[PDB]
Design a protein around this ligand. Structure first.
Ligand SMILES: [Mg+2]
Length: 368
């Protein structure tokens, strides 16, 4: 099926509370939406959520680079996923975030053509429960404890805590949370490159007592070579996030035994195609994988959830941010049940789209 036109939308939706990580603060999910049209009249959807401090992209850059990509894809076959992923790479280096949106949409089309839901199209099956954590933004320790409580009250059984401040302050944060929410609720932490190699090790041995599940990206992504040293000095397992974007990154981290687990995100791997490679590597190395994301809407996370069913090595899930939107614009897609359990659509394709005339209100451009 030939690609006849692609539409791009700027989709800014405000968050209830601002989202806060060690790298900065965000008040909106400024996302970019991608719709691919085929001659047969099929439509594939894809979304991406640029994070300036991690992707190096913004909604503004995504919206423009996306147009470069669209131009190149017009006239090609939406089924040649590999050929087209390659075609985009030949057009512009990096820019994984926007690329992933196109890649996701292509798979949507492909699965639709096969008459399967994405997860089945990818060779996965529903043989496990998908359970999301919920994130406590990095703030003053009382505020953080309060949020942790509210989160447990809402029924969530896993808490993700954003750290990355000074050693003293992060420990106070974790304590005040364990103190105000209990020792039985499972919790995981994420520094977003916030610590130096030194502070990391000191803070991580100082936190072991509080029983934490794993720590994401303790130090700068440029310092990944110091990861093995930290892994061996610390009981808490460490999970590579920013340090693990594509499959080359994965292979390299494994080769030097840098971390215990990966955080896999479609935007970092420039789509599903390469995410699959990362998964295979993590399989061959018996490494648990957490699937996550950024501020994608339920549509984006619906893609993540499909991929999440592809392998038994995947077993942790960070699919929380859509719950922070002031308004949910998504039609279909994954549904959040109690305890933070997620159900994946069974209909053909991605199994999600956007609410009627939500898109018509958005700033858009149309390639061909
Ligand atoms: Mg992370």
């Amino acid at each position: 099926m030939i690609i006849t036109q692609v539409e791009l939308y700027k989709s800014p939706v405000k968050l209830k509370e601002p989202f806060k990580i060690s790298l900065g603060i965000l008040t909106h999910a400024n996302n970019v939406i991608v719709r691919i049209h085929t001659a047969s009249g099929h439509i594939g959807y894809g979304e991406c959520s640029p994070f300036m401090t991690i992707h190096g992209e913004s909604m503004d850059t995504a919206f423009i680079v996306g147009q470069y990509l669209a131009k190149g894809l017009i006239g090609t076959s939406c089924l040649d996923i590999v050929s087209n992923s390659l075609l985009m790479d030949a057009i512009i280096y990096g820019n994984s975030c926007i690329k992933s949106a196109f890649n996701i949409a292509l798979y949507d089309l492909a699965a639709q053509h096969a008459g399967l839901p994405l997860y089945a199209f990818l060779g996965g099956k529903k043989d496990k429960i998908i359970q999301t954590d919920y994130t406590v933004s990095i703030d003053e320790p009382h505020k953080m404890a309060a949020d942790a409580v509210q989160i447990k009250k809402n029924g969530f059984e896993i808490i993700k805590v954003k750290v990355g401040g000074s050693k003293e302050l992060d420990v106070e944060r974790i304590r005040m949370i364990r103190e105000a929410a209990g020792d039985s609720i499972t919790l995981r932490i994420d520094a977003n490159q916030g610590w130096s190699v030194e502070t990391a090790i000191e803070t991580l041995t100082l936190l072991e007592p509080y029983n934490i599940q794993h720590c994401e990206e303790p130090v700068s992504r440029n310092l990944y070579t110091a990861l093995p040293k930290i892994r061996q000095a610390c009981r808490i397992p460490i999970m590579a996030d920013e340090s693990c974007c594509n499959s080359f990154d994965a292979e390299r981290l494994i080769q030097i035994q840098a971390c215990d687990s990966f955080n896999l995100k479609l935007s970092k791997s420039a789509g599903i195609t390469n995410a699959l490679n990362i998964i295979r590597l993590a399989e061959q190395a018996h490494m648990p994988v957490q699937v996550g994301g950024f501020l994608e809407s339920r549509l984006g996370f619906t893609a993540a959830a499909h991929v999440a069913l592809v392998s038994k090595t995947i077993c942790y899930y960070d699919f929380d941010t859509p719950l922070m939107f002031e308004a949910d614009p998504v039609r279909g897609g994954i549904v959040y049940q109690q305890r933070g359990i997620i159900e994946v659509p069974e209909t053909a394709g991605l199994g999600a789209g956007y609410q009627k005339d939500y898109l018509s209100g958005l700033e858009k451009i149309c390639i061909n």
